[PDB]
Design a protein around this motif. Structure first.
Motif, PDB file in Angstrom:
ATOM      1  N   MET A  11       0.835  -1.199   0.000  1.00 27.40           N
ATOM      2  CA  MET A  11       0.000   0.000   0.000  1.00 27.40           C
ATOM      3  C   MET A  11       0.871   1.251   0.000  1.00 27.40           C
ATOM      4  O   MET A  11       0.586   2.226  -0.704  1.00 27.40           O
ATOM      5  CB  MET A  11      -0.951   0.001   1.204  1.00 27.40           C
ATOM      6  N   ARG A  66       2.272  -8.263   2.244  1.00 28.94           N
ATOM      7  CA  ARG A  66       1.047  -9.055   2.219  1.00 28.94           C
ATOM      8  C   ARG A  66       1.276  -9.777   0.900  1.00 28.94           C
ATOM      9  O   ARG A  66       2.378  -9.734   0.396  1.00 28.94           O
ATOM     10  CB  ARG A  66      -0.197  -8.163   2.339  1.00 28.94           C
ATOM     11  N   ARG A  79       1.191  13.389  11.286  1.00 28.77           N
ATOM     12  CA  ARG A  79       0.911  12.315  10.324  1.00 28.77           C
ATOM     13  C   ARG A  79       1.880  12.370   9.143  1.00 28.77           C
ATOM     14  O   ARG A  79       2.261  11.339   8.576  1.00 28.77           O
ATOM     15  CB  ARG A  79      -0.547  12.382   9.861  1.00 28.77           C
ATOM     16  N   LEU A 138      -9.617  12.109  -5.730  1.00 30.24           N
ATOM     17  CA  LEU A 138      -9.296  10.928  -4.925  1.00 30.24           C
ATOM     18  C   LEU A 138     -10.407  10.606  -3.926  1.00 30.24           C
ATOM     19  O   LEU A 138     -10.449   9.504  -3.386  1.00 30.24           O
ATOM     20  CB  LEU A 138      -7.971  11.113  -4.180  1.00 30.24           C
ATOM     21  N   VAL A 139     -11.307  11.563  -3.697  1.00 31.58           N
ATOM     22  CA  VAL A 139     -12.398  11.405  -2.729  1.00 31.58           C
ATOM     23  C   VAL A 139     -11.844  11.130  -1.326  1.00 31.58           C
ATOM     24  O   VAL A 139     -12.266  10.199  -0.628  1.00 31.58           O
ATOM     25  CB  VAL A 139     -13.425  10.304  -3.131  1.00 31.58           C
ATOM     26  N   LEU A 140     -10.893  11.956  -0.911  1.00 29.46           N
ATOM     27  CA  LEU A 140     -10.356  11.890   0.444  1.00 29.46           C
ATOM     28  C   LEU A 140     -11.306  12.608   1.419  1.00 29.46           C
ATOM     29  O   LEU A 140     -12.191  13.345   0.994  1.00 29.46           O
ATOM     30  CB  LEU A 140      -8.964  12.528   0.483  1.00 29.46           C
ATOM     31  N   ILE A 181      -5.225  -1.974  -1.811  1.00 25.68           N
ATOM     32  CA  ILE A 181      -5.694  -1.674  -0.458  1.00 25.68           C
ATOM     33  C   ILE A 181      -6.663  -2.745   0.066  1.00 25.68           C
ATOM     34  O   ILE A 181      -6.461  -3.255   1.169  1.00 25.68           O
ATOM     35  CB  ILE A 181      -6.276  -0.249  -0.309  1.00 25.68           C
ATOM     36  N   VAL A 199      -7.003  -5.888  -0.975  1.00 23.39           N
ATOM     37  CA  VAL A 199      -6.292  -7.167  -0.856  1.00 23.39           C
ATOM     38  C   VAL A 199      -5.445  -7.215   0.423  1.00 23.39           C
ATOM     39  O   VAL A 199      -5.455  -8.190   1.175  1.00 23.39           O
ATOM     40  CB  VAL A 199      -5.390  -7.427  -2.080  1.00 23.39           C
ATOM     41  N   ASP A 200      -4.713  -6.141   0.665  1.00 23.43           N
ATOM     42  CA  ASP A 200      -3.813  -6.058   1.801  1.00 23.43           C
ATOM     43  C   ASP A 200      -4.620  -6.082   3.109  1.00 23.43           C
ATOM     44  O   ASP A 200      -4.319  -6.859   4.025  1.00 23.43           O
ATOM     45  CB  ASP A 200      -2.994  -4.775   1.654  1.00 23.43           C
ATOM     46  N   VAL A 201      -5.659  -5.257   3.187  1.00 24.75           N
ATOM     47  CA  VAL A 201      -6.464  -5.175   4.410  1.00 24.75           C
ATOM     48  C   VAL A 201      -7.206  -6.487   4.685  1.00 24.75           C
ATOM     49  O   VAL A 201      -7.300  -6.920   5.835  1.00 24.75           O
ATOM     50  CB  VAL A 201      -7.434  -3.964   4.366  1.00 24.75           C
ATOM     51  N   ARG A 251     -19.719   7.529   1.864  1.00 22.20           N
ATOM     52  CA  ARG A 251     -18.385   7.116   1.412  1.00 22.20           C
ATOM     53  C   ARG A 251     -18.320   5.603   1.204  1.00 22.20           C
ATOM     54  O   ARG A 251     -17.617   5.106   0.317  1.00 22.20           O
ATOM     55  CB  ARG A 251     -17.316   7.598   2.396  1.00 22.20           C
ATOM     56  N   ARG A 297     -16.607   4.757  -3.047  1.00 29.17           N
ATOM     57  CA  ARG A 297     -16.463   5.857  -4.006  1.00 29.17           C
ATOM     58  C   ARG A 297     -15.138   6.005  -4.756  1.00 29.17           C
ATOM     59  O   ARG A 297     -15.136   6.418  -5.910  1.00 29.17           O
ATOM     60  CB  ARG A 297     -16.834   7.194  -3.346  1.00 29.17           C
ATOM     61  N   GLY A 298     -14.005   5.702  -4.132  1.00 31.40           N
ATOM     62  CA  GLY A 298     -12.748   5.986  -4.813  1.00 31.40           C
ATOM     63  C   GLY A 298     -11.520   5.643  -4.003  1.00 31.40           C
ATOM     64  O   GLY A 298     -11.637   5.070  -2.932  1.00 31.40           O
ATOM     65  N   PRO A 299     -10.330   5.998  -4.516  1.00 32.23           N
ATOM     66  CA  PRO A 299      -9.087   5.607  -3.845  1.00 32.23           C
ATOM     67  C   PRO A 299      -9.090   6.033  -2.385  1.00 32.23           C
ATOM     68  O   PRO A 299      -8.681   5.254  -1.517  1.00 32.23           O
ATOM     69  CB  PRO A 299      -8.020   6.373  -4.631  1.00 32.23           C
ATOM     70  N   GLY A 300      -9.592   7.232  -2.111  1.00 30.27           N
ATOM     71  CA  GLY A 300      -9.617   7.756  -0.752  1.00 30.27           C
ATOM     72  C   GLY A 300     -10.659   7.136   0.161  1.00 30.27           C
ATOM     73  O   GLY A 300     -10.699   7.442   1.361  1.00 30.27           O
ATOM     74  N   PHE A 313      -9.818   2.359   2.169  1.00 27.79           N
ATOM     75  CA  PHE A 313      -9.638   1.773   3.502  1.00 27.79           C
ATOM     76  C   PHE A 313     -10.979   1.515   4.172  1.00 27.79           C
ATOM     77  O   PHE A 313     -11.199   0.443   4.743  1.00 27.79           O
ATOM     78  CB  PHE A 313      -8.769   2.670   4.381  1.00 27.79           C
ATOM     79  N   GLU A 314     -11.881   2.495   4.100  1.00 29.96           N
ATOM     80  CA  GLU A 314     -13.216   2.331   4.676  1.00 29.96           C
ATOM     81  C   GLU A 314     -13.958   1.166   4.013  1.00 29.96           C
ATOM     82  O   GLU A 314     -14.603   0.367   4.685  1.00 29.96           O
ATOM     83  CB  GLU A 314     -14.025   3.632   4.545  1.00 29.96           C
ATOM     84  N   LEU A 348      -3.135   0.663  11.128  1.00 34.36           N
ATOM     85  CA  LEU A 348      -3.078   1.309   9.815  1.00 34.36           C
ATOM     86  C   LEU A 348      -2.801   2.808   9.935  1.00 34.36           C
ATOM     87  O   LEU A 348      -2.431   3.446   8.954  1.00 34.36           O
ATOM     88  CB  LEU A 348      -4.377   1.087   9.034  1.00 34.36           C
ATOM     89  N   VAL A 349      -2.969   3.356  11.139  1.00 32.66           N
ATOM     90  CA  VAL A 349      -2.782   4.791  11.385  1.00 32.66           C
ATOM     91  C   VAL A 349      -3.730   5.620  10.509  1.00 32.66           C
ATOM     92  O   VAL A 349      -3.327   6.578   9.838  1.00 32.66           O
ATOM     93  CB  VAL A 349      -1.311   5.264  11.190  1.00 32.66           C
ATOM     94  N   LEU A 350      -5.002   5.248  10.527  1.00 34.77           N
ATOM     95  CA  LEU A 350      -6.035   6.014   9.838  1.00 34.77           C
ATOM     96  C   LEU A 350      -6.451   7.222  10.696  1.00 34.77           C
ATOM     97  O   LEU A 350      -6.132   7.283  11.880  1.00 34.77           O
ATOM     98  CB  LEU A 350      -7.244   5.118   9.553  1.00 34.77           C
ATOM     99  N   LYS A 351      -7.152   8.180  10.090  1.00 34.73           N
ATOM    100  CA  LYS A 351      -7.587   9.389  10.796  1.00 34.73           C
ATOM    101  C   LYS A 351      -8.909   9.164  11.522  1.00 34.73           C
ATOM    102  CB  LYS A 351      -7.723  10.551   9.807  1.00 34.73           C
TER     103      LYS A 351
END
Ligand code: CU
Ligand code: CU
Lengths: 187, 187
Positions: A16, A47, A144, A184-186, B20, B22-24, B144, B155-158, B161-162, B184-187
């Motif tokens: 990733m 992975r 971060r 990217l839809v962040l 993302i 696959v790894d998760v 999302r 929705r997209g790359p961002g 993770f969700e 994963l150190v997500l927000k």
């Protein structure tokens, strides 16, 4: 002329943390070379994702200089980067020519191994902090994404987008980074 | 026994939206098969990342059934998925056995092409909305991640993770999803 990025890909790299910066940098119009540490053959990531590099590091290092050298993380990937004489030489040259060095997750521990950027404020994956701070050669940050001059570091898979967009901003400016960010839809 | 996931990988797939999940999912202890739509050879993704699949779809589809079938996005990747008779058969069987189907970005437009999950609330990449909504066979959502029964979209790359963590929660429960999420150190 477009900016150029070298991404060094070793066995055990976090896939990733490799793919996100490569993809985002290419969206920014950066010419990215994914170079295999061990040669031209496909690389087995942490992975089980297998990625085929664009070139061997041996070949790519002869096609410098690069505007940024990027070190992905992953515990075992970073150990491989730390043990490599070729990586040591590349990072020293980049540091000597005042070029950007960007490392995420366990990636920054390779900076420690090669004595790069001592005295910088840096961050890493929380689990890699003790390794990075061995000897007290850096000052640790929980941001971060952390950028101290030409040393840019970040924390993990979930900070990969922020890390990649920071590289884009450093190389191509805030406006390009904002343009790349929107689709990217962040959050 | 562990849950099993089939990820279908076509030329032009968005590499972030492939790696993302696959790894998760592998972090969650799910047995993931990355299957190449066109055969066993490495696949050139939308940005220029080349990924070697674990198997051909032709072989993997014989080793079902899977607890989830995952469709990555990327405009051209999703067009390839939409045109495939093998994908149509796999999705119809998964829908018939009441198994989970998960699609991100332009990925859900392949559900439309194969007449899967009509009447579901779905989301897509904002740029893929008009294609998905052709004929009014779904109800559009700006969440999302959207989950309507056995149809899970994002929705997209961002949002990757969700999306991936939602698959983990659906298959292995909230507690495993929370455990996988933390490092994963997500927000
Ligand atoms: Cu990592
Ligand atoms: Cu996409």
């Amino acid at each position: 002329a477009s900016k150029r990025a070298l991404v060094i890909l070793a066995k055990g790299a976090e896939e990733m943390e490799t793919v996100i910066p490569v993809d985002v940098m290419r969206r920014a119009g950066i010419k990215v070379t994914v170079a295999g540490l061990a040669g031209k053959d496909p690389v087995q990531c942490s992975r089980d994702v297998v990625i085929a590099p664009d070139a061997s590091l041996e070949d790519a290092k002869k096609e410098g200089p690069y505007d940024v050298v990027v070190l992905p993380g992953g515990n075992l990937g970073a150990q491989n980067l730390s043990e490599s004489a070729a990586v040591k030489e590349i990072l020293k040259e980049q540091e000597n020519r005042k070029g950007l060095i960007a490392a995420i997750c366990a990636g920054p521990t390779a900076l420690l191994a090669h004595e790069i950027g001592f005295g910088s404020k840096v961050t890493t994956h929380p689990l890699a902090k003790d390794k990075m701070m061995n000897g007290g050669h850096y000052t640790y940050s929980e941001n971060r994404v952390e950028k101290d001059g030409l040393i840019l570091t970040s924390r993990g898979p979930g900070t990969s987008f922020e890390f990649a967009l920071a590289i884009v901003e450093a190389l191509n400016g805030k406006e390009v980074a904002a343009q790349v960010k929107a689709p990217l839809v962040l959050k």
